[PDB]
């Protein structure tokens, strides 16, 4: 019994608060769904005759069809100084966070102890600015015991009649203050939910009414509607129908595969706490087009739960190929973090070249420079080689002059010609270029 | 070498703990405070007189299942708040501020579990991470960036188990399951250039994501010291202390004996050994030894619950005898020990979520 | 694969705390049929018309959800308690029931 | 007392105390070095101030105490949530395949050396020899840079050989990586004041030959060895020589398949016993075969593309040779942009921009950013080229990023490769593999089996891929 | 403080779960849903009045006018193409055709009814830009220097209200936050010149003017709504550049939008900050004909239907797009039907998770609505047939 409450501890608490929020602030009107249409009763038989001018006509016809009041006190039956103020509330503006208050005083006289003091109010309150003020109120503040009494109603119609009344008082059997005020001018089914946990049943219940969603108390009519509502609006569960012949049976299991993933900006998830989910501000987003409903078929009206999306673009967070860090949409540009020449390869080439003992530096330097050049450009065809050579004397020549390694360079050219890849003219021209540049 | 235990606490979940870290970042006079990580919780305690340990804080992670492994203490220069970093099997590294009682940063860039967290002794904003991905990472905890990744063509090949900074903060040693010990250098122009570029990277400045540093070649690697698993190394001046499953700690130095540490060629192939420290009952791995901040003594846990304490004074590989401080309550195992900034108290963790304490008498 | 569910244990814990407090105060699913709130009446003022009659006021006990009303003396009974369906409560004031009933998220 | 003495104890104790003193000095010095750095660190610490930790102002945790202290209870702040990523062992970026393939007795004999003669040789033998240690008692270069200061005149063989022995023709690189190693060294108007002829008799002596210097002479030698009596060239290339000097100096001195190997027959046809002809391997351009080797391969003469079954280089699996296929354009655009040829894609290499992300099935996955057609090209399956036995051993220890190049090699992407390495396994694939013989070496081409749009996933089938 | 942040976190998780619940129940409330994530959010959207029919196929083509609102980037006026399946539906593609350059966010886009090639936009600056997408390249030049054919000088601060004048030519009205309404005759002096002068300026309002709209039948009638809580009806011919002809205290709070009825000359609607949608009639502007009260926050855009006459839709910052019905006012309801909502509320669309900047009806495909939000989500959708239809 502890096990299954532990199991259903996670969804039930969410669903209770969701019940409350949905009842007070709904997502969709439940009468508009296809499988609960019986909830709505009216029909669209008046969008053919309604003339908007008749709205004016009827409304005008139906809806077509000051005083300085004084109040006198009789004494405060306490077990002491008091004053009367008119306190009213102004309508909320976009600037003003909440409804502001305004109090105007009168400054009356004190009252005798447990037995003169009176006021004659006026038209100080303005009914003209109904666009500004919400409602007024008469107040009995000050200790030595506070009371309040609204005067006008929602549509600014005063309800405080003429007469003598006794009102109580409270700090910040009890104190009292009497006064007077006058204007001066079909059988029940046996659906048994059967909760399951650890592959064995651990509980059963009974909702003897036709049905209610136990988590949200929505009252749909028929069994098919019940299964429809339970299966969709409570996806975190896995409902299941069998046909117990006398009645109906329902089972429950926590869904191991529920799409509880975040369904918004796939960049806000990996943001240091505090900077996550900023909302306020414009952010670049990766294009994504969906088709959730294109053209449905109203197949039959029943016999499906018990008898028996398109995509495009990018809908995921991409990652850097080497760090396993997230990839920004801006960085998702033509940059591809991939090219022919990785640095570790070059360094390994140098280290492996230096590993040899029967080689002279006057040869190793030339070997390294040519290897780096070839790796940098990646020549493939034989006919490219000659151009390669001139490019080389155009590129690394400065450095070679810094080392004066030209004599070994000529030797390397001769060895290259020994492999039938260079001509006499190419070698001679490269030597000329090196001499001229030197 | 004479301590008298004055307290011994036990948790509730009875699951093993792994880390103890005294906060060495407290002004002289401020109360001694430490932290302890376990199965999936953390705990923050303060040490008091007469062997009193007062509970201060504790957190828990409920979203998943993971095993926290280590912890690290640093500070924030901007507002002088203490900062605690923790790491677990999920590969996430969490940075939490006790003052605000909230997690302030998370880093997820690894592929397997994290095993050790250490910070630069000078720079408080460089975090070193060692993982099961065979590669070591180094992050800048301020600009929310990475700096360098150690590992690749010539790097570790199997389960880097531990790493340690030198006393100054320009040399790092790493050890793993592949019987290899490797040296990384931070004094190169490459590393300082990468660090200086990391201290200035505004994302709203350029359309280019930050360029990290890949180091594919260690300064010196060898497998000749031990012949089996190595799970803890320590910088002792310019010498190295290390441990294996051979129930013996070894102190040695790279190259030949006369050779220095700032002249070692990368292609070194010879190591000079110096001495050995003997103990018993260390047949399983994952036990760490610790040294005091002043580098004057050494502590090491034991499987049968005993202790072994040496001194880094004039005496060294000779023997220093072997001081064993033991108690009859817990003999499960010991994972990690720790000393305060001074030599006041020593804390050890037993395998059954039981924390100990030994005050220093004469 | 298993997506990391968006509802972390932190927000569920906060919901549980606020839920136990609210149901300890507002009495739903125990004294109301899951879709109602129950208010209790308190007599705050007594009024006498010039013609013979008495009209009382009833300040609902939880209050700040309902406005005050003048009620005849006899009708104090049967009006000691009032049960209101959630969908019928004054909308302008219903947001006081819980902070996360409605919230203008794009603040500032 | 000869064998009993084997002298041992004296030098053993000598080494003992020497080593003890050396370690004592080293350790004391190391302590001294610890002291200064630790002092600096402490002085650094002394200029900081940090706030303390305070007890907190809903499950609660508890902690008890064995030694007489009351149970303490503190609440338990839950921690935030962090996402996660799939497991990933380290890897490295690669674009083209990477081929991969008693002491006391010495002390004693030295002591005996320090200290008829057989009496001190048979004593230590009972060491182990009266002659090996007797021999011990008895016992007790390269050609430099031409640019360098030190050098010497030498024949053409020395430096040309040093070059020849480390240049892969198939590779255009010195000691490169993916090519195996073998040793096969392959073989008017006047000038001015001091022109080479300069007289009829000198020209006659030059024709007869046709029938002061230092190390540069060796260079001169090699130059002549390939220049054959040049008029201006020899004096020109060499620093400051004159043609008459060269002439006089010359006169004075004269007084599926296995990897394609080249069919280098010394004196024999390309046909009969050829090692690469007993396995159908076409004799590519790198053979030393006769220039008219009938086992060579011609090129296509098509103009538009080689994609269709018309191209001779496309039916027999091959990528257009950039020295023989001139009409398609495999040789045009030396290393330049898009070529009209379609069977010349691997050679240059045209990867389609790929993106990494957590998969929808298992582990990681790779997604193509832009749409492709039914038979376009995407990438190459690079990595390590290893031998079959090593493939078996690596498969055993791993148990599988393995692939079958041929009957003699295996491609492994476990430690090195490119982004295309992931390609989650399936039964209904989006891509497929086709092993191609490019130039002279085998390669792997991953084409698309269908149409892939913007944002799908590739599922190359591994089942029939070994 | 921390309380506010915790409230936001809880609210965001709740909204995510609600959006999942809504996603599950799309194929029982609509007959077409199309959601797209633009690279930048848009503050305007209006269906262009031309439609192409590709023969022998299963998809028509429509065009929309959008804009970009980004920080530290370039700005564009976007002419986009959309595909919608025909009567025998299955079939989805949304693309950006023309991307001319702007200077600042596109606060409003309104095509000229007479010639569908003139797009005037209101810049975060004071000027009113008038482009012409035809006389421009198909992509923004990398320089990013605009070249609007004209540029109408006017007020001294930005605004949100722009409206052309049907049944006439060249008469465009603009509203700014400097309490003035500006008129321009673009029909006269039609050229590539860069400066036009305001023909007249009206200074009736004493608060930030939020919207202005011409009459759809009468040539010289237009209405203005501002933060003054009033609705102000003018008439150009009368020399009354200050005083109006009808002043009406419409709401108790700020009003942001007016909209005249296409099929009448007396019916107009208002949407204000008091979370009410009032009704008005020009014959007697002193009796609020009816109030619609379902929105939980401010109300920003109220638009009638191009085809039907009694269907009014209004939206706001409550992330909802309630679609009303005039013919159902006062009908007798069953208990549960009453528990749900007032009979006027015929549909509520909860597909957006952020403030709805703009929405618009399609004029050549009935009951098709395109709405954009601040989370870059733009949705083109059509409600289920059985709702508005019958047996």
Author numbering:
A (entry chain B): 83 to 147, 154 to 167, 182 to 217, 228 to 256, 295 to 322, 351 to 363, 423 to 545, 556 to 685
B (entry chain E): 80 to 441
C (entry chain C): 392 to 499
D (entry chain D): 14 to 19, 22 to 72, 80 to 123, 168 to 181, 219 to 229, 234 to 247, 259 to 305, 317 to 340, ...
E (entry chain A): 3 to 92, 112 to 412
Give sentences copied directly from the paper behind this entry.
Polycomb repressive complex 2 (PRC2) is a multiprotein chromatin repressor complex responsible for mono-, di- and tri-methylation of H3K27 (H3K27me1/2/3). Core PRC2 contains one of two catalytic subunits: EZH1 or EZH2, together with SUZ12 and EED. The recruitment of PRC2 to chromatin is mediated by accessory subunits. AEBP2 is an accessory subunit of PRC2, and its exact function remains elusive.
However, no structures of PRC2 containing AEBP2L are currently available, as all previous studies used either AEBP2S or its partial sequence, without its N-terminus. Therefore, we solved the high-resolution cryo-electron microscopy (Cryo-EM) structure of PRC2 in a complex with the full-length AEBP2L. We were able to solve the structure at a resolution of 3.6 Å, which to our knowledge is the highest resolution of a PRC2–AEBP2 obtained to date. Yet, we were unable to identify electron density for the N-terminal region of AEBP2L, consistent with its predicted disorder propensity. Importantly, we observed no structural changes to the catalytic lobe of PRC2 or to the DNA- and SUZ12-binding domains of AEBP2L compared to the conformation of AEBP2S within the context of the PRC2–AEBP2S–JARID2 complex and the partial PRC2-AEBP2 complex that was determined using X-ray crystallography. These results imply that the N-terminus of AEBP2L is flexible and highly dynamic and strongly indicate that its presence does not affect the structure of the rest of PRC2. The N-terminus displays a distinctively strong negative charge (in red), in contrast to the positively charged DNA- and nucleosome-binding regions closer to the C-terminus (in blue). We identified two sequences of 10–15 amino acids each within the N-terminal region of AEBP2L, composed entirely of glutamic (Glu, E) and aspartic acids (Asp, D). AEBP2S has been shown to enhance PRC2 HMTase activity in vitro, and the KR motif present in both short and long AEBP2 isoforms is responsible for enhanced nucleosome binding and HMTase stimulation. This, combined with our binding assays, the Cryo-EM structure, and the histone methyltransferase assays that were carried out on nucleosomal substrates, DNA-free histones and histone tail peptides, all collectively point to the same inhibitory mechanism: the AEBP2L N-terminal region interferes with the DNA-binding activity of the PRC2-AEBP2 complex.
